[PDB]
Design a protein around this ligand. Structure first.
Ligand SMILES: NCc1ccc(F)c(Cl)c1
Ligand SMILES: NCc1ccc(F)c(Cl)c1
Ligand code: NA
Ligand code: NA
Lengths: 330, 330
């Protein structure tokens, strides 16, 4: 029922956006079908964890606050696709970076990125045109998107001086995770699920803001370890954090417990494409017993999570049930 | 006074955005100064025609509807910088297309483009937080930005089949100009000048929508001719429409009046980087007496402009005065 309803609303949103282009933006059929295919390619195929979280939060709040049910659930589905389209927009922006007479494919990728973001506004301004929360919804949505771009700046420049390992600290690693990932992947679906369910001012946002960061941190640490040791056919991609000199959880944890000569060996091999230097970095990670620290670090975060949901249920009980399922996915 | 006040408000907007990053987004001073420099580089230096138009419209409406004056003028200045930042965002997006281990400059250019657009939202959500028109302002702003991305799709793909000279028509040329340029360069500053001056529903939008398209068309035709014949040291850039196979006013006008063998000569030489093929295209344009048609075409548009402002002044007199100055700039 959740996934089945989420995909129906996708068809409704897609048909509106495409008919609008045809009827109000003078778009020819060839370009309409081209945009239908681009939308399907960039927005479908993932796991929809951000989008379904909006729905799951919405259904947990109409059970403990007829016509209001069907509307809030439809509003939740539109908000879920707003985040999925936003995620599609961020992924297209990422493809432009690593993919490289006018090059029409790079022009169309940039254009795709702009269209995907504008579509989040267009579907909100339509399906929520008569909702009182539309203005508060756009502001929080626009501010989270801004937060994510700030976090991408922190991430992309963590090894240089904005016109280097000084910013390879655990507090800065959390700053990157917080802004680049946590706010839009964990906080935004929760907040949107509370807005369409009218229960936004009925929750402790501090505990909510704190769980979102901790779940994002838990998720990103596991992602960093898998990027380095999970083989490509099992990970789904080629792990490239060592080559890209990323400020990963492995790197900042290694630097805190490495010897002076080992740090020199790490600094001399990090951020290179050579297969032996990357393997030297993985050798240092293994010999530093970083795996054993990974298990303990996640445990303490999980304890902070499994105990922070309790503060949230003292004043917002139904909310805490959905946050547990979101944590279960992580 | 106009330009002097516009630059003061820029300092006020810049200080808010940068202090917000420092105080609310945990940004370090090195990155704050880097963003101040990026903002100055991308947003300053132009002619500010879009931004000053918001001011000029606002002052013409408080003269024919104390504290309300100073506030509307400040609101107009913030709206002017919203369009300038939007223009800066579009220009960065254009630089990414023709400019081409993680390439940190392409990463930072993409990031710059995202920040510049988000800044238009951030400055609106702050300085207009208590304005009743904030929601209507964002919607029209978001819809014009969407329109511009649709127009970039029409422009970038005018020579292919979205997965060719069939779309090289005068009606399609106007569609490109309308969406890609007219809406955000001519209609948007006028609309924003009416919103902050509370005189949005007091004007005939049809005549206004029609003047904006015609002025954009007038401006783009002159721009197309200069791209082809104005030398680089006098134009300010290297003209590249022939090489890029653009759907320019010269190309669509030539194809309507060329002979069968000339069209074959045009089609065989258009869209190439070779110096002799580009010169062959300019030879065809000259021999087709396109310059003589350019003067007449602009005259008829000017007549349509010099006469459409009159319909606007029958119900909105002060508006028409500013539209004339905007037309004078063109
Ligand atoms: N060195 C092999 C390895 C496997 C799994 C892990 F989690 C880590 Cl850190 C390291
Ligand atoms: N062929 C030279 C030339 C100069 C000015 C123009 F406007 C045109 Cl169309 C052509
Ligand atoms: Na998702
Ligand atoms: Na301008």
């Amino acid at each position: 029922m959740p996934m089945q309803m989420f995909m129906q609303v996708y068809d409704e949103i897609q048909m509106f956006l495409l008919e609008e282009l045809e009827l109000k933006f003078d778009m020819d059929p060839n370009r309409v079908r081209y945009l239908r295919k681009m939308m399907d390619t960039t927005c479908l195929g993932g796991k929809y964890n951000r989008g379904l979280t909006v729905i799951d939060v919405a259904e947990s709040l109409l059970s403990l606050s007829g016509a209001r049910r069907k509307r809030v659930l439809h509003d939740a589905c539109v908000c879920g696709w707003m985040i999925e389209f936003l995620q599609a927009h961020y992924l297209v922006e990422d493809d432009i970076m690593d993919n490289s007479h006018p090059d029409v494919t790079v022009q169309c990728a940039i254009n795709d990125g702009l269209l995907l973001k504008s579509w989040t506004h267009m579907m909100a301004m339509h399906f929520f045109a008569d909702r009182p929360f539309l203005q508060d919804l756009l502001c929080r949505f626009n501010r989270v998107d801004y937060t994510t771009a700030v976090g991408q700046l922190y991430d992309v420049t963590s090894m240089f001086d904005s016109n280097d390992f000084a910013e390879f600290t655990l507090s800065n690693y959390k700053r990157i995770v917080k802004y680049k990932t946590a706010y839009y992947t964990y906080l935004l679906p929760l907040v949107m699920g509370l807005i369409v369910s009218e229960a936004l001012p009925t929750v402790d946002m501090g505990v909510t803001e704190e769980l979102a960061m901790l779940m994002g941190e838990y998720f990103q640490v596991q992602d960093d370890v898998m990027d380095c040791f999970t083989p490509p056919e099992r990970l789904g991609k080629v792990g490239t954090d060592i080559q890209d000199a990323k400020c990963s959880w492995l790197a900042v944890t290694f630097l805190a417990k490495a010897s002076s000569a080992q740090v020199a060996e790490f600094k001399a091999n990090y951020g290179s494409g050579d297969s032996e230097k990357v393997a030297t970095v993985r050798r240092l990670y293994e010999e530093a017993d970083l795996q054993g620290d990974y298990v303990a670090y996640e445990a303490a975060v999980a304890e902070q999570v499994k105990e922070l949901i309790e503060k949230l249920r003292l004043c917002s009980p139904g909310f805490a049930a959905s946050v547990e399922t979101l944590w279960g996915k992580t």
